[PDB]
């Protein structure tokens, strides 16, 4: 499974990526359970496009501290070396080459990536989710030059 970070429920908005039923999903609905009062998250699996739901995890770590959280994936940042037929050639921080990294079909990512790549290839990074062996670029960033 993907490496994860804990995210307080008050910091979750529609469109955020969460782990729902063990799967990285884009949140499309946030509601309150009538039975438990907890937040319930409905999401679309980034890889399979199936719907998944999961309710928040409530914990009590210290006196008078009551916390609702969810898990989000740890995103990796890769350099883009080339774009070819709906996939990209990417490079990890350590130089490891990924020859056929898929790009999610979401929010015009491929077109935005192609536009930025053609005007400055190596300031272009992709944010990558890695789940059960599979990797996919799910967003992009233009790296500020000073970095």
Numbering used by the authors: 29 to 175
Question: What sentences appear in the manuscript?
Answer:
Here, we present InCellCryst, an advanced pipeline for producing homogeneous microcrystals directly within living insect cells. We have demonstrated the pipeline on five different proteins (IMPDH, HEX-1, Cathepsin B, Luciferase and EGFP-µNS), representing a selection of soluble proteins of different source organisms that crystallize in insect cells in their native compartment or, in case of peroxisomes, readily in the cytoplasm or nucleus of the cells. Importantly, as shown for IMPDH and HEX-1, InCellCryst can produce crystals from native protein sequences, without purification tags or even remnants of proteolytically removed tags, within a quasi-native cellular environment. The rich source of biomolecules in the cellular environment allows the identification of native ligands by co-crystallization at quasi physiological conditions, representing a unique feature of InCellCryst.
The unmodified HEX-1 crystallizes in blocky hexagons. Even unmodified HEX-1 formed crystals of two different shapes. A predominant hexagonal, block-like morphology that is comparable to, although much larger than, the woronin bodies found in the native fungus, as well as a bipyramidal shape that was not reported to occur natively. Whereas HEX-1 cyto and cyto v2 both formed spindle-like as well as bipyramidal crystals, HEX-1 ori crystals exhibit a hexagonal block shape. For HEX-1 ori and HEX-1 cyto crystals diffracted at 100 K one distinct unit cell population was found, whereas two unit cell populations were identified for HEX-1 cyto v2. For data collection from intact crystal-containing cells at 100 K, we carefully transferred the cells onto a MicroMesh mounted on a light microscope stage. Serial diffraction datasets of the crystals contained in viable cells was performed using a helical grid scan approach, available at the EMBL P14 beamline located at the PETRA III storage ring (DESY, Hamburg, Germany). CrystFEL is optimized for still images in high multiplicity collected at RT at XFEL sources and thus, can be directly applied to serial synchrotron data. All HEX-1 structures show an increased flexibility between Phe145 and Ser151, the C-terminal loop region after the α-helix.
